[PDB]
Symmetry: D2
Subunit: 370 residues, 4 copies
């Protein structure tokens, strides 16, 4: 009589789903393909919507401890400050990926979610069968495809989809704050430092706490120096001379990668007892920093619709219908912003842009009016 | 079998108590002595702790709509900016008194709390009798003394107490923002503008929204010009020339008052079926802006301890024991700050100062670590 | 026994020569081709070297009255201030062309220099004959070719020369200061506002006094909108939105012209009794603002070498040899700066750049060390 | 037939007089009471009027080399910048006393002025006799009393006079610039840092060149800590924390003195062949920094009136009548400013205040209109 859930993927969407289900009394197993539990991408921004999921999950406290809300979100064009935005009090937070990952993992273990590493889902059956690459076949009343842009839960079933892998990307790193060495300035701020002249180079400057700074170094793939890993110090120091102490530390990082952006969109998110969540269903452009946020919201809302006493198949359909438009709208707007370079203008966190952040999954309303 | 509560006082503490009790299924009546429901004091700051009570009460949304979180809390000494503080993301909000009052009243009516105006509690009996000035005697399983610094619920029973009414005070007003007329500056900020030379004059500058600015004009009682109502425009414009457009509007206000500060402290907050909440029990200095906050927290926590299935008498005792030390500590620290003029130094919203704001009544933990 | 000088051209170089000669007791006539005495180019910067000539000429006082030394010389790149320079006290001054012109004309009339308008020099003979377009032939012991880049005194004799007329230019205008309307800023500054993105547009912002602002609007000839006269308001307001009140006034000016830069360099400046001064001999790029300065210095120094009791032919040769290298060096450096866009970097008024300004013609030394 | 001048005092006024006279062909001797030629007072401000005297004296170049014109003259009240003034281009300069002293001494020796140290004038006779403390009696056609506030040339003759020695004073020092250690700011500026709260303490911050900073530390005599020598570091660092690296160096200075202000005014400046110049005749308050300036102007103008071919007695009378009102007006205004603390308001270098600086002794007109 205990409902059994099998979750594929140990990213933010999967740990979120697993926790939310385990809290509602599901018997939950989670399968991570990688040989250990880890998050990639250096750092991450969360907002009101995502922090509310964390609250719902019983993991907000561990997240807030040792993370950072900057006094302001600042934008520069050609070293000239063009905007400072605080979103009329709307909560937000910057942290390392590991930090967010550890909190979710620790919460999941505390609740006794069963976790398997080196455990890859290769096939899913909408009647509630999951097949692992070991050949083990698992039965469950619910299957969660949270297995990322390359989701095998998705693709073994067949979902009508558009996927795009961009040619351009960025280099994400964590370095020491070097705050004293930076000298005079507002170095606790989020600072988005755009340039088109003399070259197209941009740094997103993002403190995670008193010790760790998150840097996104962005330049087109066609620029050999800017796209270089480990970082071509000279060309980054040249256009960002004030960040030299941090850029120096960044250049020691041999594991730096130039990762490319990637998006996915599906005509639907469910089939029978199978639900897709996160990048598996809706990877989007980084512009509004809502990829993990939407993923977590949708994962948490999935647990919610499963508490209505309908069949799992009906709940999944009601779930998509309820929650999806927020994601579609955010994905679209984020892609638009990316393509138009809209953030470069500053003051672009309009009410529409913040619609996803403003959403409170817990009470299913929009908060923090702008 | 329905528990019956009688609440004396329609201030923030009383509306909070009434709502929280009505939500838990209490049959609730609230008695306001004044001939109509109204809040005095122009404007008010709330923090995380208080916003969480609002959430608990189902009234946060109406409060957030049309109120304001400044981008920063700034301090000036002699027109020189000495600090900017954002409390590492800790939520806060500025609003007019009416705004907070209307939200609570509207929520209370929506839940069907019975409200009586021109209804003054003059005597309370710890066995659960309340006597109104009309001579009507009401029975209830719980009596809430939320009737302010001059609480008759308190004094008709007899509580060992220290009360202090200060000689000094301030003039609190709401005027138009006049934002364009203010010209260049950071006019959405909270700005606490201290001066000791050439005179002791201070303005707390506090935007409530795009339309309404909340001003606290502070000068010692012994200064005839500064303490004057309606405001002596010349002496305020002189030391605050940049606020002239607002000060001009303020000087039209004939209802301006120089109210004095007032504190109360009691050796205990309960007797039998009677609980004291708010200024009735713990009026404090304005320095940490936590008078209404502590009041609301304590009122909401009272509802909480009444859900443990113990007698009302045991619940009230467990309530005080649980929640009081936060208030005692905040009151004390606030008085210290007031006396030492500690806020004038800037950067004084230390972790200890923010202890009350950091408290989350809903989950009974401290959040937003500093 | 009274020495007789004939001067061709009523620009700054010619009025300077005429005055300096008349002060030393020369009988002086000056011939202006144009039908009236007037100066074109809206505004002008002078420096120490040029102000010392003015002093020597007895015309400094009229110049200082109603002109302007900005508190600082500021440079912007993409609306970001990149330098502020004050040249370690070295005197400088901004004024309208008319202002400088009127002072020289008034001084020349006061000394009784004979001035003829509609009087064009078409031929000069190194034995001391000047022919006017009326056919009048004048004899003199000295002939001054101060007749501009198209000097007929020069060309009727034949001077080995390189002349260059550029394709690019700028629009020079005088408009009201509109200082209040500009609002917050440092609007008494000289501000050199460079941009390469999103277009190559630059404004030199140059207050002449409390009433008059001198604007240089620079854009390549190949840009149809930027090079347009009267000014294409939209494309200038777009990249210089903070100057809108002035740009609005500027757009009313129907007489605005897009003048092109022009340079001249000759293997020598003298022949017999004929000397060439100013643009006739050494027109240069505008970068170091030393065209009129060098012209005036060289014109004043010519008067100086004529007081040594040598023949006029020997004096002219000693004159060139003495004074020319300063001009050659300044011309060259200015052309270099122009071509490299060196001023865009800011802080480029190095000691070498200021070498011409630092020169004191009166005492024949370099002053104001850097 | 060679006119013979005897000058008492080797300060700025006496060296100025001596040089100016020696240039006009006077046979000049100068008597310095002190055992060596030296100037006290750490640093000094000069202006247009004084720099023109230097020019007239043939000593400007040595002065400009290794001295400093700040980009701006800034005023602070309670660490808040209240004004920045550049005097519409009017020349000025800051330098150490020694620097100004050495230039004058070197020029005087170069011209062959005869200089005697340990040579004190004790008596002067208006018929042209000077008596040295050695008992040597010198005859001359002119006697210059440039022997300071305690002038024996003055007092041995008897001049109706008011002298005032104030109770308050200041500590003048030269320390290293420590510019890097000062960090962010405008550290080449003259900065006049006023405070009345929490104490009456003021620093005049005055860079002399890239190596040397001139500091005036001012506090009332009645403050034991502020008036202390060597400096009470703690009380100066407390109110000027940003100057700590310099204040630290200043506290090593054992020769620091708290000198008091002193003024003198006489009903006349001449008697027969005797003229009084400088502090001997017109010591004034430091406020407009024109004590040495007026002294030098008056000393230089004395040489001027001696070239009119009248008797020395008539020239001296014409001299006083011509030049004195500028000094009387400047002295008076400076005393007013001192008493009213007028400079503390900022923007107080009005046209009237700058009247002395604006005066050009060389051409006997006022320049640099404001
Ligand atoms: C440059 C960049 C910046 C971004 N910044 C932000 C930001 O600031 N804020 C924000 O909210 N979002 C941000 N995002 C987006 C965010 O990173 C993603 O939306 C989010 O991490 C998606 O998480 P997920 O769990 O759905 O997928 P993933 O994080 O990809 O996780 C799935 C986990 O899947 C495991 N796995 C894969 N296949 C299998 C399988 N077959 N079986 C079992 N396990 C499997 C994967 O290995 C991994 O362990 C950013 C994205 C990019 C590219
Ligand atoms: C200058 C100043 C600034 C302040 N700023 C802040 C701030 O920024 N943030 C903050 O949180 N707090 C602030 N406070 C404190 C805050 O105002 C109080 O702590 C709060 O309003 C107390 O509310 P209460 O409901 O307990 O009492 P009250 O607001 O006094 O309310 C009781 C209500 O009691 C009614 N009543 C009285 N007697 C009877 C009776 N006998 N029978 C029936 N009804 C009765 C009263 O008339 C009224 O309607 C400030 C206080 C001052 C003085
Ligand atoms: C855009 C721009 C900005 C500049 N800015 C500065 C600056 O800020 N500071 C500075 O010092 N310099 C500046 N200059 C350069 C400066 O304008 C010239 O160097 C200066 O005006 C040359 O003066 P001139 O008297 O030699 O020649 P002109 O000013 O050309 O004067 C000669 C006069 O010659 C008359 N004339 C011509 N032919 C005859 C003839 N045949 N017979 C009789 N009369 C004749 C001309 O009509 C006119 O009246 C700038 C130049 C440009 C192009
Ligand atoms: C705090 C302070 C700050 C000041 N700042 C400035 C400033 O910034 N700019 C400015 O222009 N002015 C300033 N002044 C004023 C300026 O210092 C004086 O006006 C100036 O130094 C007067 O010079 P003097 O040569 O007349 O007298 P002194 O400098 O006193 O010189 C006379 C010389 O007299 C020698 N002597 C004295 N008696 C005899 C004698 N009997 N026989 C022979 N020799 C004798 C003295 O010993 C000395 O060598 C300031 C003054 C003060 C107090």
């Amino acid at each position: 009589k205990t409902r059994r859930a099998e979750v594929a993927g140990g990213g933010f969407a999967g740990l979120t789903a697993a926790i939310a289900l385990k809290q509602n009394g599901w018997d939950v197993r989670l399968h991570e393909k990688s040989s250990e539990l880890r998050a990639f991408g250096a750092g991450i921004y969360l907002w009101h919507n995502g922090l509310r999921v964390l609250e719902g999950l019983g993991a907000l406290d561990d997240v807030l401890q040792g993370s950072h809300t900057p006094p302001t979100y600042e934008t520069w064009m050609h070293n000239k400050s063009v905007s400072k935005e605080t979103f009329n009090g709307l909560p937000w937070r910057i942290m390392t990926r590991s930090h967010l990952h550890d909190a979710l993992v620790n919460r999941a273990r505390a609740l006794g979610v069963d976790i398997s590493v080196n455990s890859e889902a290769v096939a899913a059956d909408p009647v509630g069968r999951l097949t692992l690459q070991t050949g083990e076949v698992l039965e469950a009343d619910l299957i969660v495809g949270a297995d990322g842009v390359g989701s095998k839960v998705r693709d073994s079933i067949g979902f009508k989809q558009d996927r795009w892998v961009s040619k351009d990307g960025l280099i994400r790193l964590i370095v020491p704050r070097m705050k004293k060495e930076l000298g005079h300035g507002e170095w606790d701020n989020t600072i988005d430092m755009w340039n088109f002249w003399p070259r197209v180079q941009r740094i997103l400057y993002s403190p995670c706490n008193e010790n760790e700074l998150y840097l996104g170094l962005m330049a087109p793939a066609a620029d050999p120096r800017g796209s270089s890993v480990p970082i071509d110090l000279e060309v980054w120091v040249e256009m960002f001379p004030f960040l030299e102490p941090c850029l120096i530390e960044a250049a020691k990082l041999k594991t730096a990668r130039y990762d490319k952006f990637e998006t996915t969109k599906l005509d639907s998110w469910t089939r029978g007892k199978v639900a897709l969540v996160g990048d598996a269903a809706h990877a989007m452009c980084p512009a509004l920093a809502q990829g993990a946020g939407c993923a977590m919201v949708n994962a948490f809302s999935l647990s919610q619709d499963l508490e209505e006493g309908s069949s799992v198949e009906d709940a999944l359909v009601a779930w998509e219908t309820r929650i999806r438009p927020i994601t579609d709208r955010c994905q679209a707007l984020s892609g638009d912003y990316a393509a138009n370079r809209s953030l470069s203008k500053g003051n672009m966190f309009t009410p529409a842009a913040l619609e996803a952040a403003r959403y409170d999954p817990l009470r299913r309303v929009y908060s923090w009016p702008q």
